[PDB]
Amino acid sequence: AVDNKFNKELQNAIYEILHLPNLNEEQRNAFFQSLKDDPSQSANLLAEAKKLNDAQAPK
Amino acid sequence: NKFNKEFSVAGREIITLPNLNDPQKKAFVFSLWDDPSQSANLLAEAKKLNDAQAP
């Protein structure tokens, strides 16, 4: 078991998601909540966030 | 459901502090995510640290 304070993957996911340019605030906060619900999903959620970011690129 | 508009404001405040490095900001962002009710203490701590690291 990995504790959240000792989980670099979780911490990096939160920080990266905070920076993504093409998400809206609702999406960002939903990701933050989903990470709280299950930190084991950090890799999946970060990948999902990046995919949505890229689909939502303005050009 | 604690990730709301106030949480957004605090995370933005942390990353805009100009003298913190990325590991520092990531750590404060984690602490805010871990306990959003501590935004006030954490934001003040981050600003203090920022000022300690000013050129």
**Domain containing B34 — which CATH number?**
1.20.5.420
Give the chain A residue nearest B11 (alpha carbons). A18
Domain count for chain B: 1
Give the chain B residue nearest A14 (alpha carbons). B30
Instruction: Report the helix count and the strand count for chain B, using DSSP H and E.
Output: 3, 0
Q: Which of A3, A11, A35, A45 is best to mutate for the B interface (most B CBs within 10 A)?
A: A11
Sign of CA dihedral A25, A30, A31, A32: positive
Tokens representing B15? 């990353």
**Contact of A9 with A45, CB cutoff 8 Å:** no
Q: How far apart are CA A47 and CA A53, in angstroms?
A: 10
What is the domain extent for residue B42? 5-55
Q: How far apart are CA B49 and CA A39, in angstroms?
A: 28
Entry resolution in angstroms?
1.0
Q: How far apart are CA B30 and CA A34, in angstroms?
A: 14
Method: X-ray
